[PDB]
Amino acid sequence: TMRIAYAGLRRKEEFKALAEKLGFTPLLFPVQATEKVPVPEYRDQVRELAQGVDLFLATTGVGVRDLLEAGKALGLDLEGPLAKAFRLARGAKAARALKEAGLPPHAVGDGTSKSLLPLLPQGRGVAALQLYGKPLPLLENALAERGYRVLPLMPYRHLPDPEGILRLEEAVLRGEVDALAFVAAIQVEFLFEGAKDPKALREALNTRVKALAVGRVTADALREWGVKPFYVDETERLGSLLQGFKRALQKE
Secondary structure (H helix, E strand, O other): OOEEEEOOOOOHHHHHHHHHHHOOEEEEOOOEEEEEEEOOOHHHHHHHHOOOOOEEEEOOHHHHHHHHHHHHHOOOOOHHHHHHOEEEEOOHHHHHHHHHOOOOOOEEOOOOHHHHHHHOOOOOOEEEEEOOOOOOHHHHHHHHHOOOEEEEEOOEEEEEOHHHHHHHHHHHHOOOOOEEEEOOHHHHHHHHHHOOOHHHHHHHHOOOOEEEEEOHHHHHHHHHOOOOOOEEEOOOOHHHHHHHHHHHHHHO
């Protein structure tokens, strides 16, 4: 009788199959239009980074590794400019990738964007921001306030489904959902960035609707938005997510 919304683009049929095997009612509410479309401008962005920046802001371990490799593949010196820049890491995986390159961050967040706000220096010039497929509106605004132009470094781009986002928000706020499964952090971000009433959505996901997260990255995205995940799965199996949700219900 639990009504479980799924925000993923893939495995929609497996989810429905698992729902009808575990006695849940499945609901499909995708929030992305596209997934991982290459960004043609990326090599140009990396060439601009090589011209020097005042600040560098890392979000992921894999994104830092891929960025540093791209600079080398392109015949660029990124190490020199990045050594001169003030460097931040949103979380431990980005920090560690930087450390491994001999470029350990000056400031490290707690895995959320908001944790970097008190750590941003007032400055000038350019803030290069290593991205994972979408804008970071909170940080972009904060950086513009602090006197920086943002240089995005983004090898691919995910796009939101704005109407799908509004439909999912409505279903939550109309009491039509009991739990909400996010399989990726960008689904959480897209939902809250595209919502009419993120405060109400946050309230709903802390009380009447149980947020389910695949991975600590997805869980951190919920935390960014002030939501306490009901259950966080650390496998890549949907069956594990739903079975762990069941065990968490038994326990509460």
